[PDB]
Every structure is written in structure tokens, then in C-alpha cells.
Design a protein around this ligand. Structure first.
Ligand SMILES: *Cc1cccc(C*)c1
Ligand SMILES: *Cc1cccc(C*)c1
Ligand SMILES: *Cc1cccc(C*)c1
Ligand SMILES: *Cc1cccc(C*)c1
Ligand SMILES: *Cc1cccc(C*)c1
Ligand SMILES: *Cc1cccc(C*)c1
Ligand SMILES: *Cc1cccc(C*)c1
Ligand SMILES: *Cc1cccc(C*)c1
Ligand SMILES: *Cc1cccc(C*)c1
Ligand SMILES: *Cc1cccc(C*)c1
Ligand SMILES: *Cc1cccc(C*)c1
Ligand SMILES: *Cc1cccc(C*)c1
Ligand SMILES: *Cc1cccc(C*)c1
Ligand SMILES: *Cc1cccc(C*)c1
Ligand SMILES: *Cc1cccc(C*)c1
Lengths: 21, 7, 21, 21, 21, 21, 7, 7, 7, 7, 21, 21, 21, 21, 21, 7, 7, 7, 7, 21, 21, 21, 21, 21, 7, 7, 7, 7, 7, 7
């Protein structure tokens, strides 16, 4: 993952389970 | 296993 | 994933399960 | 995935299961 | 997937199962 | 992961489980 | 298997 | 198998 | 298996 | 297994 | 591959070479 | 690979070479 | 690989060479 | 690998060479 | 590897060579 | 290269 | 290259 | 390279 | 290289 | 990629960006 | 890709962007 | 990648960015 | 990567950035 | 990486950045 | 290199 | 996005 | 994004 | 992002 | 980001 | 970031 502008909002849940990348 | 309960 | 402008909103759930990328 | 403007709304659930990308 | 303007609405569920991309 | 501008918002939970990277 | 129950 | 139940 | 229950 | 309960 | 009931018989050889899945 | 009921028989050889999954 | 019921039989040889998973 | 019920039988040889997981 | 119920049988040989996990 | 000789 | 010789 | 000889 | 000889 | 006889010439530039293979 | 005799010439540029193979 | 006879020439630049293999 | 006969020439630059293998 | 016959030539620069292997 | 000889 | 300018 | 400028 | 400038 | 300048 | 300048 390159140049990712991750801007979570209010009450946002992100789960990344066993990535390889 | 992802087990997520939202409210 | 390149140049991803991820802007989650209110109460948004994103789950990525075992990606390779 | 390139140049993705992901803007989740209110109460939006997105699940990506075992992507390769 | 290139130049995707994904704007989920209220109560929208999107599931992508084992994509290759 | 390179050039990631991670800016969590209010009440945002991110979980990365066993990544390889 | 993705098992999601919405409300 | 995707098993989704909506309400 | 992703098991998510929304409300 | 990630088990997260939100409120 | 989902819900595969693989039941090899007597003297059966199966070779899967560089799958992506 | 999900829900695989792999039941090898007598003298069965299975080779998976460089899978990505 | 999730929910794999691997039950090798008599004289069964399985080789997984450099998987990514 | 999650929820793997590995039950080797009589005289079963399994070799996993340089997995990433 | 999570929730692995490994129950080797009689005369079972398992070799895991340089895993990353 | 997989080189298997069966008997 | 898969090179298998059967008997 | 996987080199397996069966009997 | 995995070199296994079975009997 | 198997049996690739890559013989670059004079002033040849090859770029492989995020392959899966 | 199998048995590829890639012989770039003078000043040849080849770009392969996110292949799956 | 198996059996790759990579023979770079004069002034050849090869860049492999985040491969999975 | 198996059986790679890498024979760089004169003034050859190869860069492998974050491989998984 | 197995059975790699790496024979750098004159003035050859190889850089492997954060491999997993 | 894994070199296993079974009987 | 591949952006290549040749001379 | 691959950005290559040739001369 | 790969940024290569050739001469 | 790989930034290589050749001459 | 790999930053290599060749001559
Ligand atoms: C883009 C990205 C997000 C989370 C985890 C990884 C490995 C990559
Ligand atoms: C674009 C992207 C999002 C989450 C995970 C990955 C590996 C990639
Ligand atoms: C575009 C995209 C979204 C989520 C995951 C991947 C791998 C890619
Ligand atoms: C366009 C797109 C959406 C979700 C997943 C992928 C791999 C691609
Ligand atoms: C981009 C990234 C986020 C979290 C963990 C890793 C290994 C990578
Ligand atoms: C269904 C299946 C069998 C063997 C290998 C894969 C990746 C999938
Ligand atoms: C279904 C399956 C069998 C063997 C290896 C993989 C990665 C997947
Ligand atoms: C399903 C599976 C079997 C053996 C190895 C892996 C990585 C996965
Ligand atoms: C499912 C599994 C079996 C053996 C090794 C790994 C890394 C995973
Ligand atoms: C599931 C598993 C078995 C053996 C070794 C590892 C690292 C993982
Ligand atoms: C054939 C090939 C060339 C470069 C990279 C990969 C993964 C494969
Ligand atoms: C034939 C080939 C050339 C470059 C990359 C791949 C994956 C395959
Ligand atoms: C064939 C090959 C060349 C460079 C990198 C990889 C992972 C594979
Ligand atoms: C074939 C190969 C070349 C460089 C790095 C890796 C991981 C593999
Ligand atoms: C084949 C190889 C070359 C350099 C580094 C690694 C981990 C592997």
C-alpha cells in the first residue's frame, strides 16, 4: 500500500486480518 | 475469525 | 493499492480479510 | 486498486474477503 | 479497479468475495 | 506500506492482525 | 464464509 | 459462501 | 470466517 | 481471532 | 475454492502448479 | 480455500507448488 | 485457508511448496 | 490458516516448505 | 495459525521448513 | 519444477 | 514445468 | 524443485 | 528442494 | 514465470510493479 | 508466462503494472 | 519464478516493486 | 525463487523492493 | 530462495530492501 | 533442503 | 497510473 | 505510480 | 512509487 | 519509494 | 526509500 491518505471519521472501525502486503 | 458486534 | 483516499463516514465498518496485495 | 476515492456514508459496511490485488 | 468514486449511501452493504483484480 | 498519511479521527479503532508486510 | 446479519 | 440476512 | 452483526 | 465489541 | 469435497482414490496424483486462488 | 474436506485415500500424493491463496 | 478438515489416509503424501496464504 | 482440524492418518507425511502465512 | 487442532496419528511425520507466520 | 516419479 | 512419469 | 519418488 | 523417497 | 530467458540489451529498462505471480 | 525469450533491444522500455500471473 | 536465466546486458536497469511470488 | 542463474553484466542495477517470496 | 547461482559481473549493484522470504 | 526417507 | 514521458 | 522519464 | 530518471 | 537516477 | 545515484 503506497500513498494512502487514511482519514477515519467518527466511530469508524477498520480491521485488516492477516494481510501479506 | 473476526467477530465484531456493533452496539 | 496506490493513491487511495479512504475517508470513512459516520459509523462505517470496513473489514479486509486475508488480502495478498 | 488505484485512485480510489472511498467515502463511506452513514452506517455503511464494506467487507473485502481474501482479495489478491 | 481505477478511478472509482465509491460513495456509499445510508445503510448500504457491499461485499466483494475473493476478487483477483 | 510506504508514504501512509494515517490520520485517525474521533473514536476510530484500527486493528491489523498478523501482517507480513 | 462471510456471515453478516444487519439488525 | 456469502450468507447475508438483511433485517 | 467474518461474522459481523450490525445492531 | 479478533473479537471487538463496539458499545 | 469453497466447499470442495476432495476424496482421492487409490493411486491418484493431483498436482496444482502455481495457483492464485 | 474455505471449507475443504480433504480426505486422501490409500497411496495418494498431492503437491501444491507455490500457491498464493 | 479456513475451516479445512484435512484427514489424510493410509500412505498419503502432501507437499505444499512455498505457499503465500 | 484458521480453524484447521488436521488429523493425520497412519504413515502420512506432510511437508510445508517455506510458507509465508 | 490460529485455532489449529493438530492431532497426529500413528507414524505421522510433519515437517515445516522455514515458515514466516 | 515438480519432478515426481511414481514407481 | 511439471514433469510427471507414471510407471 | 520438489523431487518425490514413490516406491 | 524437498527430496522425499517413500520406501 | 517459468523458463524465462531474459537477456536485456543496451540501455533497456524493465519495471515490474507489484506483481503477484 | 512460460518459455518467454525476452530479448530487449536498444532503448526499449517495458512496464508491467500489477500483473496477477 | 522458476528456472530464470537472467542475463542483464550493458546498462540495464530492472526494478521489481513489492512482488508477492 | 528457485534455480535462478542470475548473471549481471557490466553496469547493471537490480533493485527488489519489499518482496514477500 | 533456493538454488540461486548469483554471479555478479563487473560493477553490478543489487539492492534487496526489506524482503520477507 | 528437506531430505526425508520413509523406510 | 503509469506516467512515462519518452524524451 | 510508476513515473519514468527517459532522457 | 518508482521514480526513475534515465540520463 | 525507489528513486534511482542513472547518470 | 532506496535512493541510488549511479555516477
Ligand atoms: C494498505 C494497507 C492497509 C493495512 C495493512 C496493509 C498490509 C496494507
Ligand atoms: C487497498 C487495500 C486496502 C486494504 C488492504 C490492502 C492489502 C489493500
Ligand atoms: C480496491 C481494493 C479495495 C480493498 C482491497 C483491495 C485489495 C483492493
Ligand atoms: C474495484 C474493486 C473493488 C473491490 C475490490 C477489488 C479487488 C476491486
Ligand atoms: C501499512 C501497514 C499498516 C499496518 C501494519 C503494516 C505491516 C503495514
Ligand atoms: C480448489 C483449490 C485446490 C488447490 C489449490 C487451490 C489454490 C485451490
Ligand atoms: C485449498 C488450498 C490447498 C493447498 C494450498 C492452498 C494455498 C490452498
Ligand atoms: C490451506 C493451506 C494448506 C497448507 C499451507 C497453507 C499456507 C494453506
Ligand atoms: C495452515 C498452515 C499449515 C502449515 C503451515 C502454515 C504456515 C499454515
Ligand atoms: C500453523 C503453523 C504450523 C507450523 C508452523 C507455523 C509457523 C504455523
Ligand atoms: C516472470 C516474472 C518477472 C518479474 C516478476 C515476476 C513476479 C515474474
Ligand atoms: C510473462 C510475464 C511478464 C511479466 C510479468 C509477469 C507476471 C508475466
Ligand atoms: C521471477 C522474479 C523476479 C524478481 C522477484 C520475484 C519475486 C520473482
Ligand atoms: C527470485 C528473487 C529475487 C530477489 C528477491 C526475492 C525474494 C526473490
Ligand atoms: C533469493 C533472495 C535474495 C535476497 C534476499 C532474499 C530474502 C532472497
Amino acid at each position: 500500500c503506497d500513498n494512502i491518505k487514511h482519514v477515519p471519521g467518527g466511530g469508524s472501525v477498520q480491521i485488516v486480518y492477516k494481510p501479506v502486503c | 475469525s473476526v467477530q465484531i458486534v456493533y452496539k
